[PDB]
Amino acid sequence: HWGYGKHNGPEHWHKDFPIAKGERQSPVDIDTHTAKYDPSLKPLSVSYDQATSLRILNNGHAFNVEFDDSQDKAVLKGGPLDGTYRLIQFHFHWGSLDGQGSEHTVDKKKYAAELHLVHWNTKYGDFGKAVQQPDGLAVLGIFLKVGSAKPGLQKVVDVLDSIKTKGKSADFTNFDPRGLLPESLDYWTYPGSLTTPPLLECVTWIVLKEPISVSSEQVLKFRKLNFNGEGEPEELMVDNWRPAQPLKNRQIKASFK
Ligand SMILES: Nc1cccc(-c2ccc(S(N)(=O)=O)cc2)c1
Numbered sequence: 001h002w003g004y005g006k007h008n009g010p011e012h013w014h015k016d017f018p019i020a021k022g023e024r025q026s027p028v029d030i031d032t033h034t035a036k037y038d039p040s041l042k043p044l045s046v047s048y049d050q051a052t053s054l055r056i057l058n059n060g061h062a063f064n065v066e067f068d069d070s071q072d073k074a075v076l077k078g079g080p081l082d083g084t085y086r087l088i089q090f091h092f093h094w095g096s097l098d099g100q101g102s103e104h105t106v107d108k109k110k111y112a113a114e115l116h117l118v119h120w121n122t123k124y125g126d127f128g129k130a131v132q133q134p135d136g137l138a139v140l141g142i143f144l145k146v147g148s149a150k151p152g153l154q155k156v157v158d159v160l161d162s163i164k165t166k167g168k169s170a171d172f173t174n175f176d177p178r179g180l181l182p183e184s185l186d187y188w189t190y191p192g193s194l195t196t197p198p199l200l201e202c203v204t205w206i207v208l209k210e211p212i213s214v215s216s217e218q219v220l221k222f223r224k225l226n227f228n229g230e231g232e233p234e235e236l237m238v239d240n241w242r243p244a245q246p247l248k249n250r251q252i253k254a255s256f257k
Pocket residue numbers: 001002003007008009012013014015016017
């Protein structure tokens with residue numbers, strides 16, 4: 001099926017998912033000089049104190065740290081958003097080399113990786129219903145650069161050997177995603193899509209201006225994961241990013257001057 005190889009990668013997706021060529025596809029390049037400060041945008045409200053992580057899953061495309069989203073426990077509010085969005089999972093996209101890996105770019109700059117914290121609008125009742133709505137999801141995107149280690153990432157890094165291959169999962173309780181955030185919550189925002197099939201146009205993207213730093217050793221461990229299942233030829237899980245898509249009729253707004 002779809003993936004990130006020569007024969008099933010982003011340039012092929014449109015054949016099964018025609019929305020791939022749609023009017024509000026993600027990711028995009030963030031042209032910092034063209035993005036307009038919007039003084040009406042509110043500070044983001046990230047409320048993760050009551051988060052309940054449950055499990056970590058290798059799904060053959062990335063790994064997901066999954067949360068209990070059966071109550072308002074970890075929520076994103078404010079910013080460009082109307083209402084309350086519940087954290088369901090986070091995952092990353094990363095490269096084979098430090099010079100690539102991010103999905104969004106900033107003045108064409110690629111970062112080593114990009115963290116996506118995925119939230120759904122509670123007015124739609126559950127995640128499956130939310131992805132069918134133009135304002136169904138809010139994804140908080142955070143860039144990763146290689147430098148000093150991120151101590152809050154280490155618990156994630158250390159469990160990866162137990163979920164090496166597609167379909168493997170492991171208990172992953174009491175993980176605090178606040179340890180993955182940068183200091184500043186300054187952001188860019190625009191209407192877009194899921195960045196993998198089914199590529200649904202249901203996402204308010206909120207991309208933080210400040211990257212987090214992770215160590216070379218941390219990202220090297222991401223790169224030891226496998227796209228393949230157990231007992232299949234090893235294909236390293238690297239370069240699981242979609243490149244920038246046309247902005248078309250969209251404006252990127254900045255929360256900051
Ligand atoms: N080589 C090969 C064999 C069988 C199926 C495929 C394949 C399957 C799905 C897609 S896609 N990206 O979903 O359109 C692209 C390629 C590719």
